[PDB]
Amino acid sequence: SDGSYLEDQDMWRMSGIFRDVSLLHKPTTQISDFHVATRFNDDFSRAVLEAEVQMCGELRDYLRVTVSLWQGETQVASGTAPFGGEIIDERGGYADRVTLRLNVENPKLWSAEIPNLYRAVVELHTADGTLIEAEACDVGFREVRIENGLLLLNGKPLLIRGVNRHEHHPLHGQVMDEQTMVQDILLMKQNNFNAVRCSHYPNHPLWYTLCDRYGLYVVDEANIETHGMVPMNRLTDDPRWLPAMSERVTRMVQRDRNHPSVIIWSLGNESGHGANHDALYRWIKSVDPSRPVQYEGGGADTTATDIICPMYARVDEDQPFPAVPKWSIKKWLSLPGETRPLILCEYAHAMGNSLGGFAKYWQAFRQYPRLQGGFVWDWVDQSLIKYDENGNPWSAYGGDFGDTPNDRQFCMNGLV
């Protein structure tokens, strides 16, 4: 479809109904959205949980919203209000929204080292106490900000032990199940990884729940990649494609913005630098100021990124390509004017017998404060299973299905 032009990721090209199908029944008067935000004092000893709830259906005076916060079986905080937001402009406010503020003293903070979670329950009920519907999510108290050129979590500078991960199974293709996801998370933590990049599209919704519960930092990425265009920004600099790109970014943010594990948004991958990227960078900063935005295209340090995020830049050696040079990472930091942190969105290509010189990255990460780590390329080999004459299974790669043209063994870049 014309959507295929924006989905040129380096992976097997497959098709079908490849994630879950479900029916949901809601009442006519219903919770239609809710957002959860957390703010702290200077030393993280007091928090405010702010919850915005929106409804659809017929507004009545007897409608009430209660938000409560649970730690295990203990209720920690609670708030109740009728609908009607504060005045926003000359025409009034939102009659169909309400904002509750809940104080929490000495909250337990979420991080990848200690993933402390609370449970938030949102109830739409009548003034006399009859429940209409309830919704809930997991809440992690943490703060992510960039200050004086460093990415900070809960006021401390992060060092990202990251990997890129594709959704791939050798028998089921691009169908992910829970058992496979849990197996990948345990192996990552057991090998001292603390972070994962969704390369290069939003994942199955259960993935973010597991990263919240076990403790991994997530970069969540929009489904936009136009690598095979000439030049690479032919579509992302055209205003006729601004509609199609904006649906890919705005719907990801509206789905995933309540997950504590998501710490950074990404505008996609390898689509050059176009005015459409600047427009969408600014849209996210305005609706969700609580997470940085990163984007690598157009030379990794454009006005559409908060973090310098090169791919495959070397530690000591410059690669001076026209228009989009890859400086050595130690030199990139100190270019005239540059103040941002540097985190490699892809480094150390693990294809076959590889990772030579890995120690040289980790020596530099530990010595320079503004080098805050990176995501290895990548987690798992994308090989598929074929059968010989005797029905014995074997591992197959590009070109083994009569597919042509193909990129042969470039689909196998995994650490596992």
Ligand X SMILES: OC[C@H]1O[C@@H](SCCc2ccccc2)[C@H](O)[C@@H](O)[C@H]1O
Q: What is the contact surface with ligand X in residues (CB under 6 A)?
A: 10, 311, 346, 407, 410, 413
- The answer to the question of whether 200 is labelled as a binding residue is no
349 is in an annotated binding site: yes
DSSP string, 247-314: HHHHHHHHHHTT-TTEEEEE--SS----HHHHHHHHHHHHH-TTS-EE--TTTS-STT-SSB--BS--
Helices 242-256 & 275-287 angle (0-180, nearest 10): 30
Partner in contact with 334, chosen from ligand X, its own copies, Mg ion, none, beta carbon below 5 to 8 Å by kind: its own copies
Query: Cβ of residue 270: shortest distance to ligand X, in angstroms?
Result: 6
346 is annotated as an active-site residue: yes
Restricting to residues 205-264, which ones interact with Mg ion according to CB under 5 A?
227
Which amino acid is present at 17? I
270 annotated as ligand-binding: yes
Minimum Å gap between C-beta 142 and ligand X is 30
CB of residue 270 vs Mg ion: minimum separation in angstroms? 4
Residue 296 among known ligand-binding residues: no
Closest CA to 115 of 261, 256, 262: 261
| CA–CA distance, 164 with 413 (Å, rounded to integer) | 10
Q: Which amino acid is at 259?
A: H
306 is a contact residue toward Mg ion (CB under 5 A): no
Contact call for residue 349 and Mg ion (CB under 5 A): no
Give the Cα separation of 146 and 293 in Å (integer). 11
Closest to ligand X by CB, 160 vs 311, is 311
Secondary structure element (H or E) that encloses residue 181, with its range: helix 178-190
**Interface positions with its own copies (CB under 8 A):** 148-150, 318, 328, 330-331, 333-337, 339, 367-370
Q: Which does 177 bind (CB under 5 to 8 A by kind): ligand X, its own copies, Mg ion, none?
A: none
Assess contact for 38 and 142: CB atoms under 8 A.
Answer: yes
Q: Which of 123, 167, 221, 346 is catalytic?
A: 346
119 interacts with Mg ion by CB under 5 A: no
Read off the tokens for 181: 């996801």
For residues 318 and 326, the answer to whether their CB atoms sit within 8 Å is yes
Residue number closest to ligand X, CB atom:
10
410 binds, among its own copies, Mg ion, ligand X, none (CB under 5 to 8 A by kind): ligand X
**Beta-sheet pairing, 371-376 with 384-387:** unpaired
Residue of 123, 167, 270, 296 with catalytic role: 270
> Does the footprint of Mg ion cover residue 270 (CB under 5 A)?
yes
Q: Which does 413 bind (CB under 5 to 8 A by kind): ligand X, its own copies, Mg ion, none?
A: ligand X
Residue 392, marked binder: no
307 contact, one of ligand X, Mg ion, its own copies, none, CB 5-8 Å limit per kind: none
Task: Please name which of 296, 292, 327, 294 lies closest in space to residue 311, comparing C-alpha atoms.
Answer: 296
Is the bond preceding 349 in cis, omega lying within 30 degrees of 0? Answer: no
Catalytic residues: 270, 346
The annotated binding site for Mg(2+) is made up of 225, 227, 270, 406
For Mg ion, the binding residues (CB under 5 A) are 10, 227, 270
The annotated binding site is made up of 10, 225, 227, 270, 346-349, 406, 410, 413
